Each structure stands twice: as structure tokens, then as C-alpha cells.
Design a protein around this ligand. Structure first.
Ligand code: MG
Ligand code: MG
Ligand code: MG
Ligand code: MG
Ligand code: MG
Ligand code: MG
Ligand code: MG
Ligand code: MG
Ligand code: MG
Ligand code: MG
Ligand code: MG
Ligand code: MG
Ligand code: MG
Ligand code: MG
Ligand code: MG
Ligand code: MG
Ligand code: MG
Ligand code: MG
Ligand code: MG
Ligand code: MG
Lengths: 57, 50, 181, 31, 461
RNA sequence: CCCAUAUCCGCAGCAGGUCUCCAAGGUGAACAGCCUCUGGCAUGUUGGAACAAUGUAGGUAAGGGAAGUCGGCAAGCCGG
RNA sequence: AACUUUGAAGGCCGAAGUGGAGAAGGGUUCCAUGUGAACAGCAGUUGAACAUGGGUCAGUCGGUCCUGAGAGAUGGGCGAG
């Protein structure tokens, strides 16, 4: 496959090289965005559990 | 659980589809105010209750 | 973008700033006060010693609890520390200011840190879990940093072993460049 | 497959200590 | 790699380049530069080269466009690029993957044509295709090499100008087509006069028709001669060219559209088209260069071992010298079977010989296409890597199954594209169409490209 | 798919709670404790350098042996 | 790059396990690829995070059926309802 190709390359020179074609490409791209966000609950409190009960009757 | 009812499995699926970010073209609408899906859910942070 | 001070001779100056940097504000305020007034080469060498614990930053104002070290005696102080993140953040900013001097065609080897300022940025909210079913704030304390570098008459070249290092290529930088190109 | 190959490759890999930064990605150069 | 990328280094630092446009240039500004650019090239296509008198012959240079500043044509640039991607695609040449090394790589591919420009010129000067260097000397050779250097040098910048958004598309494609379109219209409206034993008459098929229809008493004879000249353009050769044009237009649009999307962003649906002519015109081009030299090679071979039945059975050769110039035709054997008919009746005379050629010509291009893809770097794996590099992916697929889905079509679109490429090229060669089936495809393709850009601009132009 | 020192409930990747099945070799009365194979893990939401006081958890103490203290609390003796 | 991965050591859980599977509960946390902005009380090239796409296939495994403790219509009774 590589041998046969090289022989083609050699023959392209001289008279018959004047006949040729064009190459090819396919690249492409698009737009970019970057927002974010994620919720959760709201905290609580006021459990009321003190312990230092010393009755000084 | 694995043992599921049809009604529960269906209710879960609707919760699955709602849980996605907004289309980015929504930002380019004329009077648009929304910046992100503010109704997102996480399976750990907040629970469905059913 | 307004700096707190106007340069004395704007054509002979280069600017640099950053906002919302996640480096402790109290540590960075002390680190900036150490290099203020330094020649750029001297300042760069000093913050590379703070990284390696060969020169301390004196903690003068925000010094509650800070320990004593032998290197603090250089600054006429007893309390010093070696903030690595603040030292590295300020080096990156010096590099940027140095580049801005080059773009303006200034003599980079004559630059002096004329003005440098650390400001608190809006705090970031995390939390920590306390006893008896309580939750408390866990605030990061970021900062805005702005510096102005000016040409003076004392010239100090770059160290020889420093300019001898390879221009490290970034594979990940290339990958993004391919996507756009 | 011969089980002594495990030892041979382990010791060969332990020889990379001297050639840090130029380790050959594949020793089986053929293919 | 090491002694090729760095050898370019010293020279690309001094060679010039075209500047990036600051902003996106206006279309009506693009059109202005394009029309200017095309006009200059066209002017080069006619100016005769300076100091060429001995041989190509001078009278033809008056007729001709051989001998113009485009004498070496855009061929060096096209051959320069193909040889690069050919070696680069095969991994034989290693291309620096960075944009800066890519920007140099462009200069390297530019450098080849500049090399090929001098190399191709030297071949034509020494052999006498302009004349002996003794007759011309250094000075005349100096100017001719310089001029042949500047024209390709100009041609290079002008294409690079269009390539970089100062115009539309690329110059080289624009240039080759304009030649093709001009040849077709010229051969229909050429006011050239041909001096015959029947008298003096015009060449252009459309021009020749009305000139003959009045100049001949036998108006049926005009119906015959006007459309059936066997040494001059005919309205048929126009009709043959027009008929092919439509069919290529039909098969130009053939393509298998694969769905793909960005692996980094929702929606954003797009598609990767596997074009049926997947291998462009390269397969048959390589095939033709093979056949032509096989005729030359056999000629020299068969003059030394003609007495050996194997060399004769390989391919025989004679010298047709009756009247016209000595032209080398094959007499029999393989090369005889590898030749196309020159007359319609000849196909009828030998039915087997024609089918043997066609199977060769369909099989060769088809086989060329199939083998070309792997080397050219357009096989599925290479395509998949480009898509991976661009962060694209087929929805629902892993990156590996893309190769499985691409191999559904690419290997087959290779062969059938080549077989279709040849088959339509047989019609182009058989029915006397102008420019060969390669040329019409080139023309239709390019005009199609500018059209689809043109309509997009018309949306707001 | 998780099924729990991170997919469940305790505001959390919380030393808590939360129903089950299978179940190797040695010592040994033993599904005890100790070591190990199959399987698994990376020390439990960080690291480095020191080895002050005071701690928390482990130890050892001459001679005496509850004289300590509200009280032998604690530890200790015993142990198959 | 102290923390990711592979290799080699040294260790631990020690078949009432830090192993292999389920019920209840969760509800996509599962799998592949990508990011390393916010989160993962240091970091991270990593993650149960975020982003883009996938994945649960039955006459025979369960439900489906039976009735258990019980719940509950009609007839009837009561009841302003
Ligand atoms: Mg929970
Ligand atoms: Mg204090
Ligand atoms: Mg303290
Ligand atoms: Mg709690
Ligand atoms: Mg420990
Ligand atoms: Mg650890
Ligand atoms: Mg834990
Ligand atoms: Mg802990
Ligand atoms: Mg004692
Ligand atoms: Mg004693
Ligand atoms: Mg007493
Ligand atoms: Mg007492
Ligand atoms: Mg006791
Ligand atoms: Mg498991
Ligand atoms: Mg388990
Ligand atoms: Mg963290
Ligand atoms: Mg996972
Ligand atoms: Mg079956
Ligand atoms: Mg029932
Ligand atoms: Mg009832």
C-alpha cells in the first residue's frame, strides 16, 4: 500500500501533473455558556435544652 | 425500593425530567429574566417525601 | 476600574489587581505590608523565601495569637509567620504587573512597588455543625489586591539561574486552544 | 502465560528510577 | 521530526505573511477583494512569458493558455500541499501540534510549492520546453525563473488572502474552476479562424454554427459538419458537457448525515456528513498518472526485448507517423486492454476489450479510494479523533462505538465514491465532454460552495 | 444501584438508630480473645516539626499497708 | 501531587468481618466520558458534586389470588344533620 502510493507520486511529475484537484476539511464549533445554581433547605434553631438546674431553696 | 408501584415509579419519573438545567437560548429571549433553574433538586440535600 | 491612588508619572508605571481572591485577607494584608516599597527583584526574592520558610512576614496588626520566630527580629518585631498562599498569590500578581511593564516598554529591572492595597471581598458562605443540633457560619474571607509599580533609579537585574529555566508548556492550555482554533 | 512474568515486569519497572522523565510509554515496540 | 521542523525554523522567520483581519470583514468588502484578486490571476493567465522563442512552437504561443505567466500554473501549490498531508497523514512527517508550530507548518507547506516552483521550472528549461539555457543564458533564465517564481508567489498570497477572510473561500479552488468555466465558454464562442482546404471558418461552436449556416448552401451539411467536427469543438461536445453537468449536480449532493452533538453542552445538535465522493478526485488522478507512465515505460521497455513473448504480451507499441506527428500508440497486450476507445465504433468492434478497460477503470479508482483513505488520515479512527479533539460525540454512544458507526459508511463511501467517480469519468471521456469527469466535479463543487455562502450573505446583504 | 463509621432516619459523608441470609486455618470447651487465607480497606472531614505545663487513656513503684476518704471510690488480689 | 492511578513493601478488618447478598427507606445516588467555578470544614488531576449521554428485558423470581388479627357496604336501627 505504501509502495504503490510512492510509484504514483513519481509518475505525477512531468507532463501529467498539470491535472490535479483540491483538499478537504471538516472543522466546526459552537457557543459556550456557564451559569449554575442549586438549592437546599433553610436552617432551624431554638431547641432549648439547658442543664444547670441548681435549686437554691 | 426495588419493589415499586406503577404510580410511584411514574411520579418519580416526572421528578427526574424536571430536574435539569434550563436551555441556554432561553437567556436570549426578549423579556427574559430567568438566570437558572431555581427548582433544582438533589437526592441527598432535599427529599421528596414519597 | 479605579485604583485608590493615581500614579505620579503614569507613563512610568504598571498596574495589576485581582478581585474575589480566596486567600485569607488578614494574612495577605501583612504580606503586602512587608513588600511595600521593595524593588521588584528584591520583592520577588523575598516572597520566594517566605514560601521556603527562610524569611518571615511580621504580623503587626492582625497578630492575635501569632507565634514568635527568630526571623521576625529582622523587622524589629517578635511575631512572624510564613503564609504560603498569600506569598504565592502576591507573586502571581507581581508577575502580571511585570508583564504589563514589559508591554508598555518599561525598564522592568528598575521597578518598585510604590502602592499596594488589600481589601476585603464579599465573604463566601459555608457552615459547620455544632453540638445540640446547631449550625454556625464557616466564612471564607477573600480579598481584593491592587498594586502599582513605578520606575526608579536603582536597577537590579534578574538572577542568572532564574532566566535559565525552560518556558514550561501547558498541555491543558493547548487542548483548549485546539477547540477554539 | 508464565507467572514469572509478573516478577520480571515488576523489577523492570523498578528500574525506571534511574530514567525519570524519559520513560518509554510502550516497551513492546513491535508493533 | 527533529531535522525537519527545525530546518524550516531559520527561513520561516524571514518570509512574509498576511495580517489577521481585526474584525469580521464585510461581505461587500469580501466581494471587492475577490473580484480584484480573480482579475489579476486572470491577467496572469494571458500575459505571454518574456523571452521564449525556440520551442515549447512560437505560433501556438500566439494562439495560446500555454506559455503564460501561469505557465507552471497553480500545480506546485496543490502538489506541495498534497505531498505534505500525504506524508503527514501517513505519520511519515510529524506536524507540530501547536498553533505556532502549525503556523510554521503552513509556511512549510508554502515552502514546498516555492521549492516545487523552481524544480518544475528547471525541468522545462533544460529540456528545451522554453529553449536551451545556452540560447537564453543566465539572464533570460534569470527573468523566466523569477517571473515563474513571482506568479506562483503572487498566486500564493492571493489565496492566503482569501483564506484569511479578506475574500470568499480560497483562491486555488476559485482559480482552477475559472479555468474550467472559461475553457467551456471559450470553446463555444472562440472567434479563432481555422484555415482549411474547405476554406476559413470559425472555431467557437456557437459562433461556428451561424457562420456556417449562412456560409454553406447545403444547410443539412451544416447540420452535419457543425455538430460533428472530428478535429474541432462541436455543439455536441457542448451538449455532452451540459448533460454531465446536471448529473454531477445530482450526485454532488449525495452524503450520509450522521447525528452528533457537543459532549459539553445540551442540545446544540449538528451533523457530520460522509460525502459519497468521500475521496475527492484523488483516486482517479493517481490512477491516471499510473496509466500514462505505464504507456511511456512500456514504449522504452518493448524496444529492447520485443522478441520475448512475455514483454510483447505485456504490451506492444508502434509508431503512427502517417501524415501527422509521430504519436506512440499501443499495438496489443495488457496496455492495449488498459486503453480507452478513441471512437464510438471502436467499442463496437471489440466488445471484450471495452469491458476489460472499464473493469480496470472502475476497479482502479474504487480500489484507489479504499486504499487512499487509510493513508490519507481520513479513516474512521482518524475521523473519530478529530471529533474527539473537537469534543463532539454521537448521542447514546461511547467514544469507541463511534468508530463502529463510522465504519458502516466511510469504508464503503470510499469505494463506491471512487467507482462512481470513475463511471461518470468514463462518460466524460467517452462522450467527448470538456474537462474530463474530474473537471466538471471540481467546477460544480466550487460553484456550489460559493453559492451556499452567497445565499447566506443574501439573507442580510 | 446503596442497604450503611458516605446512597436510609437523626438539619450533615453525624462514634447514634435501623429487619435478615452465607460463614475458612491455628490455639482453645467455644460463633470467646489472639494471629492468619479468600475478600476488602487506607486509619475514619488534613498534614509537618517538637516532646513544656495542665490534661485524657494506659503502666510501674522501695518500706508501710486504708494511716486517705462520708464511704476501700478507684485500682488492685483471685481467676483455666 | 502527602491525598489520584499503576508497581513494590509494611499493616489492619480477621468469616458474630472493614467480606458476598437482600427487606424497609432513598430515587438515578448506578454506568461511561468531561470539568475542576461552587460543594466534598486541608488539598485533589478525585468524588455519591457539577455537565453531557446511557442503563432495569420473565408463563417458571415476586405482585397478581387466599384468608389471618382486623377493616367495611347493602338489609335493618339510630341520627337535627
Ligand atoms: Mg438522609
Ligand atoms: Mg489573646
Ligand atoms: Mg492556644
Ligand atoms: Mg442532631
Ligand atoms: Mg490513629
Ligand atoms: Mg490520613
Ligand atoms: Mg466517616
Ligand atoms: Mg476525627
Ligand atoms: Mg509501694
Ligand atoms: Mg514491696
Ligand atoms: Mg479512717
Ligand atoms: Mg481523716
Ligand atoms: Mg471497686
Ligand atoms: Mg456488594
Ligand atoms: Mg453488604
Ligand atoms: Mg476543601
Ligand atoms: Mg459512582
Ligand atoms: Mg426463555
Ligand atoms: Mg385480595
Ligand atoms: Mg361501618
Amino acid at each position: 500500500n505504501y509502495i504503490l502510493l510512492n510509484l504514483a507520486v513519481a509518475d505525477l511529475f512531468m507532463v501529467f501533473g498539470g491535472f490535479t484537484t483540491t483538499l478537504y476539511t471538516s472543522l466546526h464549533g459552537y457557543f459556550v455558556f456557564g451559569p449554575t445554581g442549586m438549592p437546599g433547605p433553610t436552617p432551624s434553631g431554638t431547641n432549648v435544652g439547658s442543664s444547670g438546674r441548681s435549686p437554691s431553696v | 425500593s426495588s419493589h415499586k408501584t406503577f404510580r410511584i415509579k411514574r411520579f418519580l419519573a416526572k421528578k427526574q425530567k424536571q430536574n435539569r438545567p434550563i436551555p441556554q437560548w432561553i437567556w436570549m429571549k426578549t423579556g427574559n429574566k430567568i438566570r437558572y433553574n431555581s427548582k433544582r433538586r438533589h437526592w441527598r440535600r432535599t427529599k421528596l417525601g414519597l | 476600574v479605579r485604583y485608590s491612588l493615581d500614579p505620579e508619572n503614569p507613563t512610568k508605571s504598571c498596574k495589576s489587581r485581582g478581585s474575589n481572591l480566596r486567600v485569607h485577607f488578614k494574612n495577605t494584608r501583612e504580606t503586602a505590608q512587608a513588600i511595600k516599597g521593595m524593588h521588584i527583584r528584591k520583592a520577588t526574592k523575598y516572597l520566594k523565601d517566605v514560601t521556603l520558610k527562610k524569611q518571615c512576614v511580621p504580623f503587626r496588626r492582625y497578630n492575635g495569637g501569632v507565634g514568635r520566630c527568630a526571623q521576625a527580629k529582622q523587622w524589629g518585631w517578635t511575631q512572624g509567620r510564613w503564609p504560603k498562599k498569600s506569598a504565592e498569590f502576591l507573586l502571581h500578581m507581581l508577575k502580571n504587573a511585570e508583564s504589563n511593564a514589559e508591554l508598555k516598554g518599561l525598564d522592568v529591572d528598575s521597578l518598585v512597588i510604590e502602592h499596594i492595597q488589600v481589601n476585603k471581598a464579599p465573604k463566601m458562605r459555608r457552615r459547620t455543625y455544632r453540638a445540640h443540633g446547631r449550625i454556625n457560619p464557616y466564612m471564607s474571607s477573600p480579598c481584593h489586591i491592587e498594586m502599582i509599580l513605578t520606575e526608579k533609579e536603582q536597577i537590579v537585574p534578574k538572577p542568572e539561574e532564574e532566566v535559565a529555566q525552560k518556558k514550561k508548556i501547558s498541555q491543558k492550555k493547548l487542548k483548549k486552544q485546539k477547540l477554539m482554533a | 502465560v508464565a507467572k514469572q512474568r509478573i516478577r520480571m515486569a515488576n523489577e523492570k519497572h523498578s528500574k525506571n528510577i534511574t530514567q525519570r522523565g524519559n520513560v518509554a510509554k510502550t516497551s513492546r515496540n513491535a508493533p | 521530526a527533529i531535522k525537519f521542523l527545525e530546518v524550516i525554523k531559520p527561513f520561516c522567520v524571514i518570509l512574509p505573511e498576511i495580517q489577521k483581519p481585526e474584525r469580521k470583514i464585510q461581505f461587500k468588502e469580501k466581494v471587492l477583494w475577490t473580484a480584484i484578486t480573480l482579475f489579476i490571476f486572470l491577467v496572469c493567465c494571458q500575459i505571454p512569458l518574456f523571452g521564449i522563442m525556440s520551442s515549447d512552437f512560437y505560433w501556438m504561443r500566439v494562439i495560446l493558455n500555454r506559455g503564460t505567466l501561469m505557465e507552471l500554473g497553480i500545480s506546485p501549490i496543490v502538489t506541495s500541499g498534497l505531498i505534505m498531508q500525504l506524508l503527514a497523514g501517513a505519520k511519515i512527517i510529524e506536524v507540530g501540534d501547536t498553533p505556532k508550530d502549525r503556523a510554521l507548518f503552513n509556511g512549510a507547506q508554502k515552502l514546498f510549492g516555492m521549492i516545487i516552483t523552481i524544480g518544475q521550472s528547471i525541468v522545462y528549461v533544460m529540456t528545451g520546453m522554453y529553449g536551451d539555457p545556452s540560447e537564453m543564458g543566465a539572464g533570460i533564465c534569470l527573468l523566466i525563473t523569477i517571473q515563474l517564481f513571482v506568479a506562483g508567489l503572487i498566486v500564493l498570497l492571493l489565496d492566503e488572502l482569501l483564506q484569511k477572510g479578506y475574500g470568499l473561500g480560497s483562491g486555488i479552488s476559485l482559480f482552477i474552476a475559472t479555468n474550467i468555466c472559461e475553457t467551456i465558454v471559450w470553446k463555444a464562442f472562440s472567434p479563432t479562424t481555422v484555415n482549411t482546404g474547405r476554406g476559413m471558418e470559425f472555431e467557437g461552436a456557437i459562433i461556428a454554427l451561424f457562420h456556417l449556416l449562412a456560409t454553406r448552401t447545403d444547410k443539412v451539411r451544416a447540420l452535419r459538419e457543425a455538430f460533428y467536427r472530428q478535429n474541432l469543438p462541436n455543439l455536441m461536445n457542448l451538449i455532452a458537457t451540459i448533460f454531465v453537468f446536471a448529473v454531477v449536480i445530482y450526485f454532488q449532493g449525495f452524503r450520509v448525515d450522521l447525528p452528533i452533538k457537543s459532549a459539553r453542552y445540551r442540545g446544540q445538535y449538528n451533523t457530520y456528513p460522509i460525502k459519497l465522493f468521500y475521496t475527492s478526485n484523488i483516486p482517479i488522478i493517481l490512477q491516471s498518472a499510473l496509466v500514462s507512465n505505464l504507456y511511456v515505460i512500456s514504449q522504452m521497455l518493448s524496444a529492447r526485448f520485443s522478441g520475448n513473448l512475455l514483454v510483447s504480451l505485456l504490451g506492444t507499441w508502434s509508431d503512427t507517423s502517417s501524415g501527422g506527428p509521430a504519436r506512440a500508440y499501443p499495438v496489443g497486450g495488457l496496455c492495449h486492454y488498459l486503453s480507452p476507445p478513441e471512437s464510438f465504433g471502436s467499442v463496437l468492434e471489440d466488445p471484450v476489450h471495452a469491458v476489460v478497460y472499464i473493469v480496470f477503470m472502475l476497479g482502479s479508482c474504487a480500489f484507489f479510494s479504499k486504499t487512499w483513505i487509510e493513508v490519507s488520515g481520513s479513516s474512521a479512527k482518524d475521523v473519530a479523533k478529530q471529533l474527539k479533539e473537537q469534543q463532539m460525540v454521537m448521542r447514546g454512544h461511547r467514544e469507541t462505538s463511534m468508530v463502529h458507526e463510522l465504519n458502516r459508511y466511510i469504508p464503503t463511501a470510499a469505494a463506491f465514491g471512487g467507482l462512481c467517480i470513475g463511471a461518470l469519468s468514463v462518460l466524460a471521456d467517452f462522450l467527448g465532454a470538456i474537462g474530463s469527469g474530474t473537471g466538471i466535479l471540481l467546477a460544480v463543487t466550487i460553484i456550489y460552495q460559493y453559492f451556499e455562502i452567497f445565499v447566506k450573505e443574501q439573507s442580510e446583504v
